[PDB]
């Protein structure tokens, strides 16, 4: 068998609050900061990144480069040849993390505002550290079906599962590139876990903190995993009448299996 060919796609890189990895002001001098910016729909190079086979991420022929290996320093654009090559190498993980192998630090957006300077931080699997290479500048709106065929629904600040109904906007969830799950009625709020301990009731809270408790991944086995805690989304005691969705260790019983519908 031939080894799979490794292509070099050209994509945008979407992250916190759906903003795009952006080379500030379209300037390409060495050291110019990379930022979050509203996603464009044109062919401007400063938001289109080439994922090359040498694990470098390039816009307009120059590399996405970390300034240093300490948590807190910013990420810039730079000549791929004249920069420290270890500072230009990046791994893109299936769980949404973009890591620099030399430093083990993670591309992050410590603020959710337009123009935020991108930095490298210690991995805590937060929303501020979630990314997705794509050309889709909008999140995917979906219904989440779970135990007994019921649908996840949001009311005020609470979340539970009720009978499915197409006209219920409170049952529509937008899956953002940063790993957060947000109610369609209020894209400023997130499916949030209070603590990293078991049987913590999940709520609907503001995405402001962009915390580890607000980042989720749909696993191949049907579970919705909170990466930092390692706990999964659980219909407590398999009883929807409790109106409690919680974090709980993975065990695979039907009260932990979900499915995103279109």
């Amino acid at each position, epitope marked *: 068998a031939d080894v799979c060919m490794d292509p070099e796609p050209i994509v945008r890189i979407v992250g916190r609050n759906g903003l795009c990895v952006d080379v500030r002001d379209g300037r390409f001098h060495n050291g110019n900061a990379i930022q979050l910016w509203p996603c464009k729909s044109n062919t401007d190079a400063n938001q289109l990144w080439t994922l090359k086979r040498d694990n470098t991420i390039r816009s307009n022929g120059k590399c996405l480069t970390t300034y240093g290996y300490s948590p807190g320093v910013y990420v810039m654009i730079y000549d791929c040849n004249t920069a420290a090559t270890d500072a230009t190498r990046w791994q893109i993980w299936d769980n949404g993390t973009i890591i620099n192998p030399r430093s083990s630090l993670v591309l992050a957006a410590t603020s959710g505002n337009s123009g935020t300077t991108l930095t490298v931080q210690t991995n805590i699997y937060a929303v501020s550290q979630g990314w997705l290479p794509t050309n889709n500048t909008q999140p995917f709106v979906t219904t989440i079906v779970g135990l*007994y065929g019921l649908c996840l629904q949001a009311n005020s600040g609470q979340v539970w599962i009720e*009978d499915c109904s197409s006209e219920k906007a409170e049952q529509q969830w937008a899956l953002y590139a940063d790993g957060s799950i947000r109610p369609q009625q209020n894209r400023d709020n997130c499916l949030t876990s209070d603590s990293n301990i078991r049987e913590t009731v999940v709520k609907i809270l503001s995405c402001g903190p962009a915390s580890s408790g607000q980042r989720w991944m749909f696993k191949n086995d049907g579970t919705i995993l909170n990466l930092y805690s390692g706990l999964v989304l659980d219909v407590r*005691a*398999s009883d*929807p009448s409790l109106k409690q969705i919680i974090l709980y260790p993975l065990h695979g*019983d039907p*009260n932990q299996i979900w499915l995103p519908l279109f």
Partner: nanobody
Framework: AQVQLVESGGGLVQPGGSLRLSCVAS????????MNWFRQAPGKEREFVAG????????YYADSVKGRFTVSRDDAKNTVYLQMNSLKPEDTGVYYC???????????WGQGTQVTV
């Protein structure tokens, strides 16, 4: 329809005592079916107590009762257990075993057993 729960084992005990409640199911594949315990004190609402998944690995407990009760399952005997240790006056009530469901009409209760003090 013939699916039915028979709770048993409630009694009158004094604080610090212990009791094991048992509910025996019939009419369905008992294995893999989640089973939960509820209790309704005089005047108050039915409140969730504990619940077991497919294995005894999987157990959910209300805060009121952690570290004292143990929900248990014996698939061979079609039986759910609620071991009740270090009993308190606050635990008095009728204890119901329930098979939860998506619609409330498919919820499945037994007749409950009385626990006092």
């Amino acid at each position: 329809a013939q699916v039915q729960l028979v709770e048993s084992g409630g009694g009158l005990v004094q604080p610090g005592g212990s009791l094991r409640l048992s509910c025996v199911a019939s009419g369905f594949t008992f294995s893999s079916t989640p089973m939960n315990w509820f209790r309704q004190a005089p005047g108050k609402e039915r409140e969730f107590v504990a619940g077991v998944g497919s294995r005894n690995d999987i157990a959910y407990y209300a805060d009121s009762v952690k570290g004292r009760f143990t929900v248990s399952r014996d698939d061979a005997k079609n039986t759910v257990y609620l071991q009740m240790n270090s009993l308190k006056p606050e635990d008095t009530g009728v204890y119901y075993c329930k098979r939860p469901a998506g619609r409330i009409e498919d919820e499945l209760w037994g007749q409950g057993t009385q626990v006092t003090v």
